[PDB]
Amino acid sequence: YDKETKTHATLFGSVACEHISSTMSQYSRSTRSMLKPV
Amino acid sequence: CNGFQKCEQLLREYGQFCSKINQALHGANLRQDDSVRNLFASVKSSQSSP
């Protein structure tokens, strides 16, 4: 979160670099409208 | 709830339990981090022979 300046960042734990893509449509995330790259 | 939508809403009935569990685990992990940091802050002699 970074509460002081509200600069949120998203980290995937132990996940291969090749698989994740921006705006990925291969996952059926549930009850999570939307989510918000070295 | 494995992720089935019908199961997820039956859980919305219980929503606060999941929050309590998540917060407890988050606090425990933070305390572990602090403990490690403190211990190695005392192992740090600050004077050494290469």
Side-chain angles (χ1 to χ4, degrees), chain A residues 1 3 8-9 11 16 19 21 23 25-28 30-31 33 35-36 38:
Chain A
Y1 180 41
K3 180 193 59 175
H8 52 271
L11 156 74
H19 313 149
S21 59
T23 71
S25 302
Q26 58 262 16
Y27 306 118
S28 47
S30 304
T31 330
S33 304
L35 179 136
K36 188 181 184 302
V38 68

Short mmCIF file of all heavy atoms in Angstrom, two decimals, chain A residues 1 3 8-9 11 16 19 21 23 25-28 30-31 33 35-36 38:
data_model
loop_
_atom_site.label_atom_id
_atom_site.label_comp_id
_atom_site.label_asym_id
_atom_site.label_seq_id
_atom_site.Cartn_x
_atom_site.Cartn_y
_atom_site.Cartn_z
N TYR A 1 0.81 -1.25 0.00
CA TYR A 1 0.00 0.00 0.00
C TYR A 1 0.83 1.29 0.00
O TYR A 1 0.48 2.18 -0.80
CB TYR A 1 -1.02 0.01 1.14
CG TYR A 1 -1.88 1.25 1.19
CD1 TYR A 1 -2.40 1.82 0.04
CD2 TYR A 1 -2.19 1.85 2.40
CE1 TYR A 1 -3.18 2.96 0.08
CE2 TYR A 1 -2.98 2.99 2.46
CZ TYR A 1 -3.48 3.55 1.30
OH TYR A 1 -4.26 4.67 1.35
N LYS A 3 1.10 3.69 2.59
CA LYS A 3 0.04 4.62 3.06
C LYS A 3 0.48 6.08 2.94
O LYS A 3 -0.37 6.91 2.59
CB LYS A 3 -0.30 4.32 4.53
CG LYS A 3 -1.39 5.19 5.14
CD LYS A 3 -1.46 5.09 6.64
CE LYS A 3 -0.16 5.48 7.32
NZ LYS A 3 -0.29 5.48 8.80
N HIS A 8 0.41 2.32 -4.45
CA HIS A 8 0.25 0.85 -4.33
C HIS A 8 1.08 0.11 -5.39
O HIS A 8 1.22 0.65 -6.50
CB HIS A 8 -1.23 0.47 -4.40
CG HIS A 8 -1.94 1.03 -5.59
ND1 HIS A 8 -2.54 2.28 -5.57
CD2 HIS A 8 -2.14 0.53 -6.82
CE1 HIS A 8 -3.08 2.52 -6.75
NE2 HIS A 8 -2.85 1.46 -7.53
N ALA A 9 1.61 -1.07 -5.05
CA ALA A 9 2.35 -1.90 -6.02
C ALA A 9 1.89 -3.35 -5.88
O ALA A 9 1.51 -3.73 -4.76
CB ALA A 9 3.84 -1.77 -5.79
N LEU A 11 2.68 -7.49 -6.21
CA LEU A 11 3.78 -8.49 -6.31
C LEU A 11 3.18 -9.90 -6.38
O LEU A 11 2.25 -10.19 -5.60
CB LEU A 11 4.69 -8.34 -5.09
CG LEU A 11 5.50 -9.57 -4.69
CD1 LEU A 11 6.66 -9.80 -5.65
CD2 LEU A 11 6.02 -9.44 -3.27
N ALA A 16 6.45 -17.53 -12.12
CA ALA A 16 7.40 -17.41 -13.25
C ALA A 16 7.17 -16.10 -14.00
O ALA A 16 5.99 -15.70 -14.18
CB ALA A 16 7.28 -18.59 -14.18
N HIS A 19 4.81 -16.27 -17.42
CA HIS A 19 3.33 -16.46 -17.36
C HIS A 19 2.51 -15.18 -17.15
O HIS A 19 1.50 -15.03 -17.87
CB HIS A 19 2.96 -17.46 -16.26
CG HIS A 19 3.78 -18.70 -16.27
ND1 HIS A 19 4.07 -19.40 -15.12
CD2 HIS A 19 4.38 -19.37 -17.28
CE1 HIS A 19 4.81 -20.45 -15.41
NE2 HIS A 19 5.02 -20.45 -16.73
N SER A 21 0.89 -11.57 -17.42
CA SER A 21 0.80 -10.53 -18.47
C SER A 21 -0.10 -9.40 -17.96
O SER A 21 -0.95 -9.68 -17.09
CB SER A 21 0.27 -11.11 -19.76
OG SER A 21 -1.02 -11.67 -19.56
N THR A 23 -3.21 -7.02 -17.64
CA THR A 23 -4.65 -7.25 -17.97
C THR A 23 -4.85 -8.71 -18.39
O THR A 23 -5.55 -8.94 -19.39
CB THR A 23 -5.19 -6.21 -18.97
OG1 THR A 23 -4.64 -6.44 -20.27
CG2 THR A 23 -4.93 -4.79 -18.54
N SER A 25 -6.23 -12.25 -19.10
CA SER A 25 -7.63 -12.74 -19.22
C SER A 25 -7.68 -14.26 -19.07
O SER A 25 -8.73 -14.84 -19.39
CB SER A 25 -8.24 -12.29 -20.52
OG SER A 25 -8.22 -10.87 -20.62
N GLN A 26 -6.57 -14.88 -18.65
CA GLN A 26 -6.52 -16.37 -18.56
C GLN A 26 -6.93 -16.83 -17.15
O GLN A 26 -6.95 -18.05 -16.92
CB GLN A 26 -5.14 -16.89 -18.96
CG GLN A 26 -3.99 -16.34 -18.12
CD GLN A 26 -3.27 -15.18 -18.78
OE1 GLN A 26 -3.77 -14.57 -19.72
NE2 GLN A 26 -2.09 -14.88 -18.29
N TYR A 27 -7.25 -15.89 -16.26
CA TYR A 27 -7.61 -16.25 -14.86
C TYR A 27 -9.05 -15.83 -14.57
O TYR A 27 -9.40 -14.67 -14.86
CB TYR A 27 -6.58 -15.69 -13.88
CG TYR A 27 -5.15 -16.07 -14.18
CD1 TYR A 27 -4.21 -15.11 -14.48
CD2 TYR A 27 -4.75 -17.39 -14.16
CE1 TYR A 27 -2.89 -15.45 -14.76
CE2 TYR A 27 -3.44 -17.75 -14.44
CZ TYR A 27 -2.51 -16.78 -14.74
OH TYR A 27 -1.22 -17.12 -15.01
N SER A 28 -9.83 -16.72 -13.95
CA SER A 28 -11.22 -16.37 -13.54
C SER A 28 -11.21 -15.88 -12.09
O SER A 28 -11.77 -16.59 -11.24
CB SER A 28 -12.14 -17.55 -13.72
OG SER A 28 -11.56 -18.72 -13.17
N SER A 30 -12.50 -14.16 -8.83
CA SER A 30 -13.94 -14.10 -8.47
C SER A 30 -14.25 -12.96 -7.50
O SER A 30 -13.50 -12.81 -6.52
CB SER A 30 -14.37 -15.42 -7.93
OG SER A 30 -14.10 -16.46 -8.85
N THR A 31 -15.31 -12.19 -7.78
CA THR A 31 -15.75 -11.08 -6.88
C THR A 31 -14.63 -10.04 -6.76
O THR A 31 -14.52 -9.41 -5.69
CB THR A 31 -16.30 -11.60 -5.55
OG1 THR A 31 -16.88 -12.89 -5.77
CG2 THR A 31 -17.34 -10.69 -4.93
N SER A 33 -13.75 -7.22 -9.31
CA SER A 33 -13.93 -6.46 -10.58
C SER A 33 -12.60 -6.28 -11.32
O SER A 33 -12.46 -6.83 -12.43
CB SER A 33 -14.59 -5.13 -10.32
OG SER A 33 -15.83 -5.30 -9.65
N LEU A 35 -7.93 -5.40 -10.89
CA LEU A 35 -6.71 -5.45 -10.03
C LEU A 35 -5.75 -4.31 -10.42
O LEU A 35 -5.64 -4.05 -11.63
CB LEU A 35 -6.06 -6.82 -10.26
CG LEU A 35 -4.77 -7.11 -9.50
CD1 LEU A 35 -4.80 -8.51 -8.92
CD2 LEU A 35 -3.56 -6.94 -10.41
N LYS A 36 -5.16 -3.58 -9.61
CA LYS A 36 -4.25 -2.47 -9.99
C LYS A 36 -3.12 -2.37 -8.96
O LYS A 36 -3.40 -2.64 -7.78
CB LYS A 36 -5.03 -1.15 -10.06
CG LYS A 36 -4.26 0.04 -10.62
CD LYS A 36 -5.07 1.31 -10.64
CE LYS A 36 -4.34 2.47 -11.27
NZ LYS A 36 -3.06 2.76 -10.58
N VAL A 38 8.88 -4.79 -14.02
CA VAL A 38 10.11 -5.60 -13.77
C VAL A 38 9.71 -6.89 -13.05
O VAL A 38 8.76 -6.86 -12.25
CB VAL A 38 11.19 -4.81 -13.00
CG1 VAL A 38 10.78 -4.49 -11.57
CG2 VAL A 38 12.53 -5.52 -13.03
#
